[PDB]
């Protein structure tokens, strides 16, 4: 077949019931994730190839970056609780990987302050049980598949994208193959 298990995707040996239709995992320490955001815009290109209104979910992971990796998962929970993902994703990626000005939870907070989130409202979210539960939700989603690599995308709790099997000579061709594979998997 044109799409084959082991080529563009792999199939989870234990499928996960109740998962979101499209689920992405990333780390602000992950270099391919940085590219997926700034250069390839993978999430937006996948969204444009799926029907209107499909749910897409994106979670941060703990396993890169030690203490700060976990702080970043909590900060991503804050961003999701406050609905400010689009305001903080690029400055968090650049603060970690480009300028290397993010070295502490305080430096993370500065990114949110600079993006116009009020200090009081950041701190209230950071300490909230709603955010504690969003941290648990991110960890649980990752744990369901003993995730050890990002960027990762799962479709319908069943299929895992395999970008290792896609053309990397051309960035736009790669994005198109990735998104068309997601579309194919979502129609399975
Ligand atoms: O770990 C792997 O090999 C799989 C993988 C995940 O995200 C990626 C992003 C890439 O970025 C490019 C660069 C130039 C053209 C097209 C794509 C390349 C490969 C991968």
Numbering used by the authors: 1 to 188
What's the paper's own text on this?
Like many other thiol-disulfide oxidoreductase enzymes, the active site of DsbA is comprised of the characteristic CXXC motif (Cys30–Pro31–His32–Cys33 in Escherichia coli DsbA) and a highly conserved cis-proline in an adjacent loop which has been shown to play a key role in the binding of substrates. Adjacent to the active site is a hydrophobic groove which serves as a site for both DsbB and unfolded substrates to form a complex.
The phenoxy group of 25 occupied the hydrophobic end of the binding groove with the oxygen atom of the ether linker at a distance of 4.1 Å from Gln35. The side chain of Gln35 is conformationally flexible in the crystal structure and therefore unlikely to form a hydrogen bond with 25. The carboxyl group of 25 is positioned more closely to the imidazole side chain of His32 (N–O distance = 3.7Å) compared to that of 15 (N–O distance = 4.5Å) and possibly formed a weak polar interaction. The similar binding affinities observed for 25 and 28 suggested that the oxygen atom of the ether linker does not contribute to the interaction, which is consistent with what we observed in the co-crystal structures. LE values showed 6-phenoxy 25 and 6-benzyl 28 were the most efficient binders.
